[PDB]
Amino acid sequence: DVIKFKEPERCDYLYVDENNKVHILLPIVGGDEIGLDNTCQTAVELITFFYGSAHSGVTKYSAEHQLSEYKRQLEEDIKAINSQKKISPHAYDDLLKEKIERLQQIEKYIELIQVLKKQYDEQNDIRQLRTGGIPQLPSGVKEIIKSSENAFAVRLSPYDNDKFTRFDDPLFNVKRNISKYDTPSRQAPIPIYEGLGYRLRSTLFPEDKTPTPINKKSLRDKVKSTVLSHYKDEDRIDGEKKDEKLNELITNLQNELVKELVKSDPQYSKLSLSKDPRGKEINYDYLVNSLMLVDNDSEIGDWIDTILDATVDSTVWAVQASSPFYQGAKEISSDRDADKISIRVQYLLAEANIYCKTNKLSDANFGEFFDKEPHATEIAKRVKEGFTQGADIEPIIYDYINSNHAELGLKSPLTGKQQQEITDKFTKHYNTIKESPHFDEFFVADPDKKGNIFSHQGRISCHFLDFFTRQTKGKHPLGDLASHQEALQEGTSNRLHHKNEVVAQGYEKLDQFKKEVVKLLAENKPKELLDYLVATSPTGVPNYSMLSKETQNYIAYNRNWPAIQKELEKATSIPESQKQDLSRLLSRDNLQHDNLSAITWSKYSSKPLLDVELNKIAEGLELTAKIYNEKRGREWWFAGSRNEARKTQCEELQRVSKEINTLLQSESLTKSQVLEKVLNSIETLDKIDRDISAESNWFQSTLQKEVRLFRDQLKDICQLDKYYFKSTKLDEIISLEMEEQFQKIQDPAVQQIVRDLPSHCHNDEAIEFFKTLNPEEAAKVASYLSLEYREINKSTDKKTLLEQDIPRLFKEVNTQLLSKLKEEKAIDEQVHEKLSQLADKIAPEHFTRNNIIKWST
């Protein structure tokens, strides 16, 4: 007796634009703007899109299945709307239209995915994703990346490089060592002694083992150097005029602090060093005799230290943005450190190169220039210089670019604004990849520029149609989807919203409709209501097409109904077929009167599904283990030899993946089951990380950085509010914390009542009130609430006071009938006064003409 609308406001891979065009987006890599380099990255996204899982899963999470499910939900919603058409022909016409348009497009995309996989995969370009040991980007995808305007790969030169690069057309490329994977031992690479990478590494820490000092002093270290530049080693705050030298130093320090602050952030202009954060006045007595910190003849700097510590807040220090280059360390005192910075520098050059490419200033490969001499060595030197002096590293690089701006394919060098744009991107993106296992390559996207690459749901993606067109080589025409790619290009941005507002508005429009209906009834405006109900949409559909059990009752049982009924008869501007519709739907005295179904939609469809997200994690663990074992050679045979610790850890990853997988297989999944598996999985991953940490000895293990990533992902899942859950039992997307709150209602009859109630009755305060009731008290309240919109909070809501409020309203509503009957003379005064006493005790739904006739007899 309730219609539950099942089309979700969100679906993996599915974007719906403002003109209701369905766009499916094939993902290339996971991330926004930049995607991290991990053994499996590009793999996981594609594998999932095309097949639910590489193996050990159902086809449940593929694009085809997910779209087929979406398709089914629409068909259910359409069938439901149609069920209401028998009662009110216009019912939900706008929604029905929108839902049919999406249905038809969804169906077409599904055929294409079916077709592409069967007819146009003869070389096994898709298939290899799930079978081949190290999956490759498909051909279509590589073509899309090559031809892109807003997305590019950059290849870097870390010391321990990995030859299995996925991106074959980097914009930025530098010379790399011979990967350990091209050596027989497979344990360390063969270094090369030319190139930018070697020049940076060897310069920042040479084979003489002579460290490079990192002397960065700011901002307090800087201010203390500038203020002490004017003072001597000897002078104290002593002599006859001790308060005056103090006050001068406080003013001088104050001035220099606000001066270096505004340069960094002009917004801390009115700060005082003459009073502490409490509000008490800073003076000689206060620092020497009340706190005891600074004695008499204390040094100038210790006075400065203490003034600062007493007056300044802890937040302000370190307030200014920090370069990725300055991580805090004293000096570059090992090889590990040198590579961290080699890569940092390389990545900055990569980022500048990217800026210059997306902005059409150059088409060149900056790395092809900086690997050549003298440039390789000269930039490595200037950087080492810079670190010792503590200077800003970023401009050193920009200056050298400007110094050779023509050689790098630019007409003008980089402006000060352009330079800051680059620096800030470099900062954002480096911090994202700071803890990447690998630094071989990175795919970077710009969604604020036009091109063939997009950003949707935390995936960097291409249009599925672009990939399809290309994979089939133009053979299968798109039919009605042939204009769709264009349509998306024609958009405002390439950064697409994670949820689909067009769908969400479909429902919000219904909510808005009841809200108005509720308002106009409370303001007792029957003529405006009737006008609002016949008012049309741009498609000409009258507003009464959004009537449902809730609103139909609100009107039918209202005091303004007789006024509304009169307005209805006495009106000419409204066609008779709607004039009947309305009287049929809202006059309970009409013999053709029939009740519409109640209407609901999920309040949590816009959130990512728990199971979908877990699947991605399981899938990622499997892949990692698989491509890891496929990257070792020629040592496949048992056994270690220390083989087990590396190998039993990989067995441990699969164990987790299998377990998460079997967790998902279960229907009737509960908050506590999920939480329990997820922590037990987190702990296993934690032990693995711990086992590695001890072993050393000491080398940074890529696997450690990989398990950390997976643990974090699983930690994110424990915030179950951020996800929704498909209940297979009730076929609806719910929240596990709403089911918690519903379950916390003891008695099953009361609980069900509360569930069947409108959304306004599903808040926390309300369910507490309702659990102080019994099944008979509950149904009385339910009926009560169906008569006129009221909110139940704790305050002000009294169970007793409510049992006076119900009777009042029952009696008021039912009198409408009795007064009508005695005016008609359809009842004796015998039964009029007998019923008039009964009026406050009988639910209006049961207080009807037939019932009275039956009742008297």
Residue numbers in the entry: 8 to 864
What does the paper say about this structure?
The effector SidC and its paralog SdcA anchor on the Legionella-containing vacuole (LCV) and are important for the recruitment of ER proteins to the LCV. Recent data demonstrated that SidC and SdcA are ubiquitin E3 ligases and that their activity is required for the enrichment of ER proteins and ubiquitin conjugates on the LCV. Among the currently identified PI(4)P-binding Legionella effectors, the protein SidC and its paralog SdcA were shown to anchor on the LCV through a 20 kDa PI(4)P-binding domain called P4C (PI(4)P binding of SidC) to facilitate the recruitment of ER proteins to the LCV. Recent structural studies of SidC revealed a novel N-terminal SNL domain that represents a unique family of ubiquitin E3 ligases.
Crystals were also obtained with a truncated form of SidC (aa 1–871, from here on referred to as SidC871) in which 46 residues were deleted from the C-terminus. These crystals diffracted up to 2.9 Å and the structure was solved by the molecular replacement method using our previously determined SidC (aa 1–542, SidC542) crystal structure as the search model. The final refined model contains two molecules of SidC in the asymmetric unit and each molecule contains all residues from 8 to 864. The crystal structure of SidC871 reveals that SidC comprises four distinct domains: the N-terminal SNL domain, the INS domain (which is inserted within the SNL domain), the P4C domain, and a C-terminal unknown domain named CTD. These four domains are packed in a single arch-like shape with the P4C and the CTD domains in close contact with the SNL domain. Unlike any other known PI(4)P-binding domain, the P4C domain of SidC comprise a four α-helix bundle and the PI(4)P binding site resides in a highly positively charged pocket formed at one end of the bundle. A pocket is created at the other end by two loops (L1 and L2) connecting α1, α2 and α3, α4, respectively.The calculated electrostatic surface potentials revealed that this pocket is highly positively charged and it is the only area clustered with positive charges in the domain. The interaction between the P4C and SNL domains is mainly mediated by extensive hydrophobic interactions between residues L629 and I633 of the P4C domain and a hydrophobic patch consisting of residues V50, I53, A60, I140, and P141 near the ligase catalytic site on the SNL domain. However, C46 in SidC871 is shifted away from H444 by about 6 Å.
